[PDB]
Amino acid sequence: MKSPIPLRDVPQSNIFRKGDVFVLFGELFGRGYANGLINEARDAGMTIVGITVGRRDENNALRALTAEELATAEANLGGRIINVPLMAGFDLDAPAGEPTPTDLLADMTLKSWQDDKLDWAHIEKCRAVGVQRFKDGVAKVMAELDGMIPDGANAFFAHTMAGGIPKVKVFLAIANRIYKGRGERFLSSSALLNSDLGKLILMNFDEVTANTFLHLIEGSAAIRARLEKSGGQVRYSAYGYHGTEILIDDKYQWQTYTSYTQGKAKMRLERIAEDAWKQGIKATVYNCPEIRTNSSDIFVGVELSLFPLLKALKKENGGAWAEAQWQACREVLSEGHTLESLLQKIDDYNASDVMKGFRNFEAWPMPNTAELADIMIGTSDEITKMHKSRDALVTDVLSALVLEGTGPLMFHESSNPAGPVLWLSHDVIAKQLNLMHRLEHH
Numbered sequence: 349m350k351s352p353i354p355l356r357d358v359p360q361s362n363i364f365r366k367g368d369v370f371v372l373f374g375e376l377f378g379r380g381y382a383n384g385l386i387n388e389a390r391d392a393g394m395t396i397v398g399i400t401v402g403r404r405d406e407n408n409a410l411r412a413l414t415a416e417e418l419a420t421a422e423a424n425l426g427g428r429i430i431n432v433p434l435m436a437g438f439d440l441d442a443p444a445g446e447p448t449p450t451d452l453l454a455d456m457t458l459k460s461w462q463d464d465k466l467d468w469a470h471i472e473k474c475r476a477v478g479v480q481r482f483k484d485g486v487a488k489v490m491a492e493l494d495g496m497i498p499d500g501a502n503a504f505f506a507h508t509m510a511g512g513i514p515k516v517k518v519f520l521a522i523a524n525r526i527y528k529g530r531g532e533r534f535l536s537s538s539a540l541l542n543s544d545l546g547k548l549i550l551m552n553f554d555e556v557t558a559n560t561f562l563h564l565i566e567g568s569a570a571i572r573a574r575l576e577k578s579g580g581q582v583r584y585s586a587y588g589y590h591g592t593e594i595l596i597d598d599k600y601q602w603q604t605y606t607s608y609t610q611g612k613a614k615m616r617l618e619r620i621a622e623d624a625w626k627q628g629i630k631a632t633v634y635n636c637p638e639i640r641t642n643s644s645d646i647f648v649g650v651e652l653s654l655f656p657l658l659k660a661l662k663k664e665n666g667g668a669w670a671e672a673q674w675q676a677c678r679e680v681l682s683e684g685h686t687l688e689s690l691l692q693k694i695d696d697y698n699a700s701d702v703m704k705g706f707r708n709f710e711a712w713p714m715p716n717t718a719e720l721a722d723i724m725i726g727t728s729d730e731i732t733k734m735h736k737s738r739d740a741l742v743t744d745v746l747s748a749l750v751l752e753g754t755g756p757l758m759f760h761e762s763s764n765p766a767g768p769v770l771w772l773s774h775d776v777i778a779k780q781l782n783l784m785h786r787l788e789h790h
């Protein structure tokens with residue numbers, strides 16, 4: 349697409365009932381986006397089922413969960429977990445006794461990594477082994493799930509998977525320079541992406557963040573057909589990131605965190621949804637706002653995009669509850685610092701020529717720059733130092749609100765989706781949150 353495809357109106361329809369089955373295709377963590385959606389599924393009375401990625405033994409081989417592990421995971425999910433290790437990516441896959449891609453990274457150093465070259469034939473061999481492992485896993489899971497979804501049921505498959513970062517020591521050093529580095533410690537995104545290391549990482553990102561959705565859609569085809577033929581409905585959702593419209597100069601304008609390294613994989617995810625949609629499959633990627641979760645915590649500055657949600661809460665027919673949210677955010681700031689000052693510093697940030705330059709949709713994701721690093725990391729740091737405690741942040745409050753709002757948006761839109769790719773920006777999320785709280789006054 350050449351511009352965002354916004355969802356503007358709060359959806360009101362629902363087809364899901366007791367007996368219908370919600371499948372979490374990913375693991376549920378605290379602060380995770382999926383919390384919003386799964387709670388909706390739970391309150392609609394759906395049967396909750398999920399997958400596990402399994403665990404690694406110390407021979408670094410994949411294993412299913414133990415009884416104890418499974419019980420814990422199932423209590424955390426609030427439903428059954430199918431005990432098959434559905435770990436995506438190929439960074440730890442290889443033919444028996446041969447190096448993994450991770451092994452091939454083992455002798456890269458801080459001095460050598462930009463120029464180190466990889467045996468791409470071997471990496472391709474590993475990719476094939478890993479991909480076939482994941483497909484075989486998906487077939488296992490779908491075989492078991494098929495027996496759990498009766499004829500006539502509706503099924504909701506919710507994809508959440510994103511990742512593919514290799515567990516090697518050199519990369520997090522490189523990462524701290526790319527994501528947090530200023531001045532002489534700045535390292536451009538391009539430096540990583542042009543290296544063989546970066547190329548490998550991007551291949552893994554495509555596998556985990558994008559191709560897993562395709563494997564979900566293909567792997568569940570028999571179930572889909574049987575349900576569709578027996579009066580059921582089937583839906584697929586995925587969490588996308590492709591920038592977000594936020595209030596800049598009292599207008600909702602698309603912007604993004606830069607540089608979003610998963611960007612190529614997220615656009616491949618979108619393409620998978622579009623291809624499936626043309627085949628009559630109801631698959632939708634929901635491009636959701638920047639928040640702080642386990643997967644985005646490292647992206648220092650990503651959270652700068654979230655603060656103007658406060659202004660959206662007021663703009664979208666905010667009343668007493670929105671005012672209470674402002675009060676809540678005021679309370680975590682140190683005496684002498686006002687929420688107004690915080691928000692003005694964010695408006696100043698988006699007003700800057702440097703930041704205005706990154707509002708280029710067609711160029712997304714753009715490479716970062718030293719100027720970007722200085723203003724983004726500087727601003728993020730300043731705002732964090734406005735807080736009473738660095739463990740109680742305005743962004744904690746606001747990230748929880750976005751979970752809460754995107755939940756019903758995705759759950760209800762999936763009953764009758766407008767298209768294969770939809771943006772949930774601050775406008776529609778604020779509308780949803782104010783509407784949910786229309787009875788909470790004072």
Ligand SMILES: NC(=O)C1=CN([C@@H]2O[C@H](COP(=O)(O)OP(=O)(O)OC[C@H]3O[C@@H](n4cnc5c(N)ncnc54)[C@H](O)[C@@H]3O)[C@@H](O)[C@H]2O)C=CC1
Pocket residue numbers: 373374375376377378379380381382401434435436437508509510511512556587588589635636637638639640641642643644650
């Ligand atoms: N946090 C943010 O700012 C945004 C996140 N998203 C997307 O939301 C989705 C959920 O992520 P978050 O809630 O942010 O964090 P999270 O850490 O709670 O979720 C990550 C999910 O990816 C799964 N995952 C990671 N590696 C995997 C692997 N090798 N194999 C199989 N599954 C794997 C995890 O089980 C988990 O379900 C992701 O796709 C993310 O890209 C979308 C927009 C913004």
